[PDB]
Design a protein around this ligand. Structure first.
Ligand SMILES: *[C@@H]1O[C@H](F)[C@@H](O)[C@H](O)[C@H]1O
Lengths: 773, 773, 260
């Protein structure tokens, strides 16, 4: 929202008042309160007839500093409120002195300057990482529309860049843009988003969550170029500064605070296939696709039934279209017998044509307007109504239907929609419509998740969700929505995936091949590599099927190659997934996140890091040309084994069976002995691979159990020409390949054997040391 | 302006119609007219009751394709219109086939697809650099405000970045932001700008000029992330695609098309001096100020009389304050004799308090509202009126006043202000107020410029302009405006300077230390280096007294050091300036411009190239820490002589007398034998410096004459271990230094001598040849 | 109420949507439901993001066919309602073929044409006495006052004359006049009336009652010269076609239906 009109003026009709001077500092328990006047009040003749801002500083978690700035406390302030994890006994330090008032949690502190020259500085071990200058926060009275806002402007230093604010499709670095945290169904090609999160972080080691579920309006370097301005229509503004000093540290605190990404079941990492959106389909169609996959040796693990599994115009009354699917449970058991997992489409709305509608209306389970009538419109479905999830009985009714599908063999759900929630309505529990808009995504997803958690069990729960709100990262794997089948759209989609990881979400997916339009073969090919090298992979389309043979023969080879490669990577991949669930580190990571101190990584959005050790750069050209940057070190292509010197840009050309996939040096990777499924005993038959272990370093590898815990650890430290190898845990018949190492000098406790990738060592007893030539 | 509401909807109240099918193509001389319908009109029954767009393709210059799409031609469409150089005899090819219609100029062509699939594509030798997809242009009928717009959306490909749109201070790469081309006096810390230009260019080698003086609203990847949208309130939209393929080539065509940067006289390159804004002074005060500089051996060449050479509140009636300056011409001619040039402040407004105000009013030389009363207000001045430059007699009155000053000894003027032009007025010539807003800046500066042309001569002409419009780049050296005294603001300022060069402007100046605020010594020192390593530099402010030693003695050395340096660099500097004049290549170049193929240079804004051969990276920290990227090659620090390897980022620490100033390998640089003044016989005593001439390469150095032409060329070609040195033209007592070259095997036609920077050779026979060791 | 602006245009600020194609027919006991889309929805790609009308045919009395066209069913729709005599056991015939969907009570039937050419027809012994042509019924969304209406236009043949609509003092034959069924105290010399009845009959032996107590706006050959148009501010429209074949027979049924 524009407040200023250039450096010298203010927008017409706005009256601003700012806290310009500290009047009094009070300590209440472990919280610090600061009273600030809009003017000089050192004279008692001025200590009256004036507004007074109440700034409260507190800490909900170590390293997190909460700032609450209030105007009037008499406001109603109804919920819902974000699902924050708030501790009341965090150890903090409050020092109120002559010149300053400082609140401190861990290494992060908020310091207010007393005296004439007001100032609010956020410090990390004494140094200022950001803050608010005088007159850059306060209250706004909009005379034009009778609305009142609170606002803040946190500084940005030279070269400081901003990231996050949910899954957004605009340029990766927020600087220069306006963003409104407001869930909208606007595709993947605009400034709109299905997943808004009022949280941002910078390449300076800290982030900030503006604690308001209603629309927050950010001007990221868009009004005042060197600052991040945010405003909300409220009588108070509350935000949390979250300390790093690294992007992963920020996310770790952020997710501990708002919610840890759950760990999805191993099978969910397999290949997903869909009937597609408005294409035709019945059981025969299903089996045709499945037999088609098996026939061409294309591993497939999850099959998804989209919208038309239900009668048109009756969408989400949960009843199978009898004409297209005469025997639902029969058809599902046969697919499962094949070792496949099943997911069906659902959403939180309901068309009037459904016979269930009248029942729901009679019971008051649908969202009503103030006058008591039903809220309805004709978008998506004719006479569409919304399930009122603030209504206990409506929740149970919805959930009972979902349990009916599960008891039928269904293993998970695709939670589509949930963003276009109206405000001209009256919720059953009286919540504030402006806050229910964004938060609805959370309530919807939380409801479905718990049905899974109470049936299939939490270990087995996973969803495919299109919308979200703070805290929704707890119900894993969200997908980038409705993209188009072209390179530009594939790129924009990658920016969104990267962005959402920068917002606390650990698992992301996208429609391989694009949703709208039918992609030419080469595009489909490139997208397939990108898709399989993502935490979650799904072949899904709008008006055309996504089966590889719908494009060409080589497409089938591309799909098989990458699907196999992914299943062979699960020992590594599933460990990087346990990290998302432990520290909120997302599987797909922006380069700036993994290499925070490298200045060349700031604007990189066409490449990413998949887990801690491998850099993947999708190809966005027909010819196969691709440019990517590599951080310091000597990287090694994952299967071509060629090497590249880091800390510079590289240009290559790859055919459809390749793309840059480079492994960091000093890495010990664990590849599995199964390229047909993602879920299998990873610590048996394991094949370790050591990449450029330097003199003086130690590469560590942890192999996980199906539950994510480390069942076996393997370390390789190199002192001189001697590299010692030790393992701890449970592992059977494993191997250790010294990448690009032709011959060895000696080998204690182990038999060796050449390989095209390098010497392969077999462990004999305990010591398995090797001497380099 | 927001047109769409996400991928699937349109903004409420907006009715859209687009050209969706070609109906007929026609050729009229060297122009192609395409009639497009908003629907299928193949049947005669639908060839009625429907709108019909008329698209016209033409070419004003080789390589430039103009596109004019219009709805109703009945509108008034009054001037002013940009000062475009339009040729009517440009060789073009027009092809009208069954499948396509194509218009071509140079290697660029416009192609419209006939049939069911409408498509507008711009091609460079058959390859698509950009275009407009079906429904991404057309007419907008705003039902909410009765306003009608025309809009276009030109595609951006993967990794494509946009630059330009005037002197702006937001992030350098426009992707993700919206910009309105409307002059405003909004300072240098926000999205507003004093100098707006509806011209942008990309890293794909092409640019586009939206030919509308009124306000053009750009959504650069902000509405449709993969497209640059632009709209204007009009019944027609006309834009020009300008071909490169390199950034420098686009600017070459753009400046040939809208105007070439004039070549500023050599003296204007010296250090400019101004005694703040609010200082109290008279003649004795001025001299005692100049002497202070001379007394500390701080060379000065231009002195600027700001605001107060006139009586307060009477600003710009051209009357010297009678009390403060009893004898104007006497003081100027005395200052002149001290080896100085005189510049004075002026602006296009006039205060009520001035005696002249009534005269102008009774003569009708001031801007009037429709009712005939004078337009007035109280910002900056009380009852401030505006000179009506569309009035032939008012222009003459103002012009004569300037000639009066010039005849008094004034050499140049600072044309301040000119941005806040009201639209609820009625110009003398009846121009369209909406278009006069931006164009006023052009008229204003053009009038002034021509006064100098007609008095001191075109070669002596120069200004310090704050506002600008398309075509204003012909009135050289535009000034960066009022900037704050901190590092973030020093950076915002560099971004603006880079941006203006990327908009057709060849010369940019800024104030050392800033305008507002009180800057700490270190900030002042860092800015001094950055300011002298610019095309035009000025010591100035607004509050503090303009004395370097008021800070500390170091501030004085810094100013002396970099002022001497710039003067020595004039043989190199004035040559590059001739380039701005001939090819529209700016002296201060963004990296992306000099190294268009290096993917590491896309987002670099904290460094720049000063001329073809030298990279300067200002220091933005107190401690002196600085990180900068170096392109391919072995770079050498201009005076520290140290070397660095390219294609990578470097971290260094510098004291106040230094900063990263690196010279390119394979470069022959010419240094002057005078470090006191900028204007001197550069081709005498010249000091050439050869930097890492590689085997099989050649280094050329063109030493310019006063008028900018090359008076002496020196080439050094290396064949093996034999570098041949040949010269052509007029030169005397010159020398050649082999940087980092101590011992050399042999030498022909010349003697040698050792140096700290490397061997120094002296010619005699020109058959001068060196043979390495 | 004026909906059209001549044959070719629509009144400003009005957005219309009409049932143009049958999408599904369903018999519910002695009642027939017809779902019609406002556009071609034969392809699954168009079976979303579109309004959908629900027409229900029924019979409260022998020889009377009730027609209820609905948009949103979420409206409050509070009482009171007319004192209608509604029987639940009227003997009717419902035949849903591939070409038509027909509901019959007594010698009167309502027939909807499936396929590309939508048409709602009322037949007496298989012959057309009146009916609604494509785009002559539907929903009106008034943007000028944010009000929404449902409307219908029942055909009038050559020489067909309309009567009734209460105790009115204008020309006996309604053809050519607009009449609002809203009780007013306006004397006996104007278009106003003390006793308004949203019931009309013709010299063709059939009558129709618009089942709406609120104000019903009738344009009897005043907007569309060959049709009797009636609109009401509601999310649903419900009228009853009453078979004669003689005026006295129509009244017999009408009074047996509303009161003797
Ligand atoms: C929700 O809408 C459609 F139903 C589905 O096909 C799509 O993948 C998702 O965006």
């Amino acid at each position: 929202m524009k407040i200023s009109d250039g450096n010298w003026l203010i927008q017409p009709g706005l009256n601003l008042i700012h806290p310009l001077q500290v009047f009094e500092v009070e300590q209440q328990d472990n919280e610090m309160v600061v009273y600030a006047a809009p003017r000089d009040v050192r004279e008692r003749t001025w200590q009256l007839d004036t507004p007074l801002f109440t700034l409260r500083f507190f800490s909900p978690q170590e390293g997190i500093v909460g700032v609450r700035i209030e105007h009037f406390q008499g406001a109603l302030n109804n919920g819902p409120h974000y699902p924050l994890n708030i501790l009341q006994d965090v150890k903090v330090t409050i020092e109120n002195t002559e010149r300053y008032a400082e609140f401190k949690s861990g290494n992060l502190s908020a310091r207010v300057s007393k005296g004439e020259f007001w100032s609010l500085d956020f410090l990390r071990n004494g140094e200022r990482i950001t803050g608010s200058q005088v007159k850059n926060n306060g209250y706004v009275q909009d005379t034009n529309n009778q609305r009142n806002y609170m606002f803040e402007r946190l500084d940005l230093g030279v070269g400081e860049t901003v990231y996050g604010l949910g899954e957004r499709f605009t340029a990766l670095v927020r600087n220069g843009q306006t963003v409104e945290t407001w869930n909208r169904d606007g595709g993947t090609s605009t400034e709109q988003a299905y997943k808004n999160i009022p949280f941002y972080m910078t390449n300076r080691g800290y982030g900030v969550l503006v604690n308001h579920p209603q629309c927050v309006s950010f001007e990221v370097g868009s009004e005042k170029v060197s600052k991040v301005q945010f405003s909300v229509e409220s009588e108070y503004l509350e935000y949390f500064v979250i300390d790093g000093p690294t992007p992963k540290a920020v996310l770790d605190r952020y997710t501990r605070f708002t919610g840890r990404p759950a760990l999805p079941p191993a099978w969910s990492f397999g290949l997903w296939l869909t009937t597609s959106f408005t294409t035709n389909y019945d059981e025969a169609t299903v089996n045709s696709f499945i037999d088609g996959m098996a026939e061409r040796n294309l591993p497939l693990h999850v099959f998804h039934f989209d919208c038309f599994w239900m009668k048109a115009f009756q969408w989400c009354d949960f009843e199978w279209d009898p004409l297209t699917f005469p025997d639902p449970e029969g058809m599902i058991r046969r697919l499962k017998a094949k070792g496949l997992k099943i997911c069906v489409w659902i959403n939180p709305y309901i068309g009037q044509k459904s016979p269930v509608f009248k029942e729901l209306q009679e019971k008051g389970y649908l969202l009503k307007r103030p006058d008591g009538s039903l809220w309805q419109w004709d978008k998506w479905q004719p006479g569409l109504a919304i399930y009122d999830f603030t209504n206990p009985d409506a929740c149970k009714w919805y959930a009972d239907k979902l349990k009916g599908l599960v008891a039928m063999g269904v293993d998970c759900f695709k939670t589509d929609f949930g963003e276009r929630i109206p405000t001209d309505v009256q919720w059953f529990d009286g919540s504030d419509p402006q806050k229910m808009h964004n938060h609805y995504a959370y309530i919807y997803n939380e409801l479905v998740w718990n049905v899974l958690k109470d049936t299939v069990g939490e270990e087995e729960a996973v969803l495919f969700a299109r919308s979200a709100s703070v805290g929704a990262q707890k119900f894993p794997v969200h997908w980038g929505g409705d993209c188009y089948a072209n390179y530009e759209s594939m790129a924009e989609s990658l920016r969104g995936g990267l962005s959402i990881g920068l917002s606390g979400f650990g698992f992301w997916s996208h429609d391989i091949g694009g949703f709208e339009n039918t992609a030419p073969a080469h595009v489909y090919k490139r997208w397939c590599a990108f898709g399989l090298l993502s935490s979650h992979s799904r072949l899904h389309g709008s008006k055309s099927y996504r089966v590889p043979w719908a494009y060409d023969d080589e497409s089938c080879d591309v799909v098989r190659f990458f699907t196999q490669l992914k299943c062979r990577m699960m020992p590594y991949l599933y460990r990087e997934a346990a990290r998302a669930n432990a520290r909120g580190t997302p599987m797909m990571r922006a380069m700036m996140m993994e290499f925070p101190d490298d200045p060349a990584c700031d604007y990189l959005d066409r490449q990413y890091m998949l887990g801690d050790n491998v850099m993947v750069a999708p190809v966005f050209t027909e010819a196969g040309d691709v440019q990517f940057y590599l951080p310091e070190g000597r990287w090694t292509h994952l299967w071509h084994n060629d090497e590249l010197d880091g800390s510079r840009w590289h240009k290559q050309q790859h055919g459809f069976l390749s793309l840059p996939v480079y492994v960091r040096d000093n890495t010990l990777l664990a590849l599995g002995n199964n390229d047909q499924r993602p879920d299998y005993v990873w610590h048996e038959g394991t094949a370790f691979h050591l990449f450029n272990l330097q003199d003086g370093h130690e590469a560590v590898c942890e192999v996980p159990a199906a539950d994510g815990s480390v069942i076996f650890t393997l370390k390789a430290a190199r002192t001189g020409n001697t590299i010692t190898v030790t393992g701890a845990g449970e592992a059977k018949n494993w191997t250790l390949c010294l990448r690009n190492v032709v011959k060895v000098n000696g080998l204690q406790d182990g038999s060796q054997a050449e390989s095209e990738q390098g010497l392969v060592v077999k462990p004999q007893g305990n010591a398995l040391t090797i001497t380099l030539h």
